Known about the structure:
The structure is cut from a larger assembly and holds three copies of chain A and one copy of chain D.
Chain A: E1 8-13, E2 19-23, E3 35-40, E4 60-62, E5 66-72, E6 77-84, E7 95-100, E8 108-111, E9 139-143, E10 147-153, H1 156-162, H2 168-174, H3 176-188, H4 194-206, H5 222-240, H6 251-270, H7 272-275, H8 279-309, H9 312-319, H10 324-328, H11 332-336, H12 340-352, H13 359-370
Chain D: H1 2-6, H2 16-31, H3 34-38, E1 39-40, E2 48-49, H4 51-55, H5 60-73, H6 78-86, H7 89-100, H8 117-129, H9 137-155, H10 161-171, H11 183-189, H12 193-213, H13 229-240, H14 251-255
Antiparallel strand pairs in D: 1-2
Helix pairs in contact in D: 5-6, 6-7, 7-8, 7-9, 8-9, 9-10, 10-12, 12-13
Amino acid sequence: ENSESLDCQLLAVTHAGVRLYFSTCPFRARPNTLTLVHVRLPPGFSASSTVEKPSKVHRALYSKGILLMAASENDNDILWCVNHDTFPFQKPMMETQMTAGVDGHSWALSAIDTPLNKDHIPITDSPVVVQQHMLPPKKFVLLSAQGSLMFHKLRPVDQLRHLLVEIERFFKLHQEDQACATCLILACSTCDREVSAWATRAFFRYGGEAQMRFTTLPVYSGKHNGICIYFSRIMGNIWDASLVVESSVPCQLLESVLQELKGLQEFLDRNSQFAGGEAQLSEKISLQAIQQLVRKSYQALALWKLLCEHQFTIIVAELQKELQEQLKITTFKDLVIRDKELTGALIASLINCYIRDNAAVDGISLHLQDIC
Amino acid sequence: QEALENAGRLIDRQLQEDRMYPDLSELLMVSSGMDMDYPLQLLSVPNLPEISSIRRVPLPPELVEQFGHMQCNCMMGVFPPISRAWLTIDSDIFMWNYEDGGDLAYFDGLSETILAVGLVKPKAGIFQPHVRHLLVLATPVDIVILGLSYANLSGGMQLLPDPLSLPTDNTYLLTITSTDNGRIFLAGKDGCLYEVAYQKINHSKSSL
Amino acid sequence: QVDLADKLLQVASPFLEPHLVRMAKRYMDLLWRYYEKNRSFSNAARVLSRLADMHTEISLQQRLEYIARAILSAEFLHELEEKMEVARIQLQIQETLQRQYSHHSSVQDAVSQLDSELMDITKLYGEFADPFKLAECKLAIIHCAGYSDPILVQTLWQDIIEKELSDSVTLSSSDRMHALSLKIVLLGKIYAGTPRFFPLDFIVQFLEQQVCTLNWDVGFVIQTMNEIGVPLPRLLEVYDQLFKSRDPKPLHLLDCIHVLLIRYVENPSQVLNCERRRFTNLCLDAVCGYLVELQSMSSSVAVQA
Amino acid sequence: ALQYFYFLRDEKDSQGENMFLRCVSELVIESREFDMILGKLENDGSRKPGVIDKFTSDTKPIINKVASVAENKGLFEEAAKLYDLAKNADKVLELMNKLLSPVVPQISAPQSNKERLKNMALSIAERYRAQGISANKFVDSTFYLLLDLITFFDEYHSGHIDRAFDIIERLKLVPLNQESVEERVAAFRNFSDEIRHNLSEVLLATMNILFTQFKRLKGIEDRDSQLRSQARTLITFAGMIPYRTSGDTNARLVQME
Lengths: 372, 208, 305, 257
């Protein structure tokens, strides 16, 4: 796809297992002859390799260069998969290639799920790290005559999990900030063993003892970046989008976001003492700001959870006046970093009118009192 | 100074950084030689292994049973959007739910051997633009187009003939593909290319 | 081995009792079995106590659940209750450790230590309270110890108050007002029963003096003590003594007592009415006049609901 | 009576005024004609005025007085009614949760679809929750749970075996999944008092539908295995908390055949 790479139109896989990449240039009516941009060789280990020999047609490339190779030796059938390590790929390129369990003939491969690619531009297309949360888990289909095999991509969280006992390796490849972020997610992550959560909490809070230290240096510590990255990634889809059109996002989604942020809110609230309370002070300020932000998002989402319950649409239509243009082009972030007066008026209408039912209504009145 | 604005700025900056991330493929990256973390052994890359095998589902015997007798031709495949698998033995075709397996659908419509099957998107503006996907089936004689959909009540699979038959006797349609324009291009064992338009007619692109 | 163990509870066999006893020190299952096994309360309790005291890792939450269970079955009692008290302290210390930001996650070891077992009071005090400056905990601990020494007790109080000052910024005069009252009331509830940690006489002025460098509303100081669990009658006599005893202005005391009397009369129906509104605290004690004529007998202690 | 008492004011002056007030207060109390005297049903739109309100004023204090008294007697319904007028929304739901909560646990054969505590439950939720709801989230949550359990009852019996499982699972109270039965233990003690009481019937409802639905069929995809695993997890659950339950693990009777 041009989204993945503007220049590269096609990839050819040979019987040898060599991958050829060709660039092109279209126009409204004329194609351009393809040129061979690059070539990749099979790892026997390296180049002269006959490991991939022979390679069957079954082989296919998964959007964002994930290579599934079906090889039929002249002794048996072998399956290999190559996935670029996106993380180190945040500059150098590296591919992790491993053998796979399937031994039977491989009829056809397909992707059960959309591709994980983050952006629709060559820039940040491949960042899996960013869309690890949002993008659905990647699942791959291998069809054999005998049965269907399902393969699952391993997320960075899983990688960290394996590494839980040594996380330097994650640190090395991925970087400290990312390690912190994943560490935070594991700590919060639900159905996890206490050992895992505690260890991840320990890493997040203290890093590795007498090894990797967790710190602001005369920039902000990895902890801050990790937490912020986490927050940014979850919200990334919704953040820019307009809140109201009916609400742009569905109720299920609202509940999902609210629940997730709630977990984070509680987490930070609980271990706020550690983070808060000059590089050190700057870290304190930054963390304080982030925590306030998480709570604020919680509040906005909470209100929306409320609105979903009922008769929101009718009031909206009747209410909107001259201010309306401003209202409609309000983004979620606008709520995140609030536009207080309009909401207050609207909320008052929700209460004044019958729409809010029972417990909900009490809550807004509480809200207006508290932060209004 | 305000923390709230401050936090917003931090996230936005980071978001920007995430978006800027380098392009996946560059010739410069492996101009000398490829860095490979390649083990022959499963789970050889302990922490790193990109993929794991979650499960294996065998073809249901109930499905297989109606594949027992096949003189002429066999073929099978997976439909990516459907999350269903298909099996073709001679004239008949089966579709089976990936997740279930018990649930299978059978086509009794086709009289003749089935050369090829394919899943395609509907055209922008025909009577069936609404349907999510179309199933193209080619036999020696004809090409049939049906509609696939999911019942919202049962959540079962609904197949309806969108009676559209295209005579393609000579062709021996080897391959079928589509552009999401809704245009369908197929090739017979007759050289490189042909294109179908439902609005039946076949027109060779590569000129007859 | 079969994990048939639950069935074991059922077995009547006279052989069974000695079996459990010998095996008693995944034995914990045997013991969960044992206390349950004992229909008798006394025997059951003795086991859970040992269960809690035991050297295999068992979470404090469980250790306490054992005690909660053991206590329910209520010198054995003596040991059990002391245990509950000390265990509770660790829970508090443990909770604070989470909030504290001075701590490092990797020094998880402390939590492991806390949940792992009951600890020496001195160990808890010297090791935890002082280094982590948990003044409240230290105070509570010394309550249980029953350490009387007023200087040490007071000195500890001074630190708590001083620490409180540090965090405050001023806008939150009210905010701090609440937080301050909140902190004091909590500790106050635990200690207030005993006079040594909670010298009401010594403490009240100390608090007023502290808060004095803040915006003031009358009744702010006394209300906390009332909430603390101190009775209206107790507060009254001591306060009156403070009033009369001091050679000085105590405008503050007069005001607060004024607020106290007003607070008290409304709360019980007994005291209620007219001779009162006039009262704007002085030695024009409404109660004092009442006492002279009828008698000193107020009534039973009145406490805030 | 109200009309006559009102004349008392005709003698203008204090004393008489209080006498009037006391008389009305005395009338409300012991006559217990709250709706007529005090008012009724919000449908938003505050109170629909009672006869006295038409006359007006001290009416809130009388309500608290009456309501508290209702509490002594235990005349629930009157209390709920009184608190609604009081506009103590949180209090109403809480009393309400209690009323609906018991009567839920018990023995079956009831609940016509039209009037009573359940019906009362429906009234309040629809009524308050949409509108600027002043109640605690916690209070409302238990409220919804009680309603969900009730709808489960309606459909439990009157057929609809399949539907009952779906709803019960939605409750997220009982382990349908794996051996996560124990997590259901950890989250059990935490449970509010109102629900903690109700679980007995939740179990056994499950083993019932589970039984009847899984009547061994006659003569193909039949996954009997599920709706079987569910019973298993449920039994482990029941096995873990029998002591903290009324004492009817006669789930066993329904369990087997």
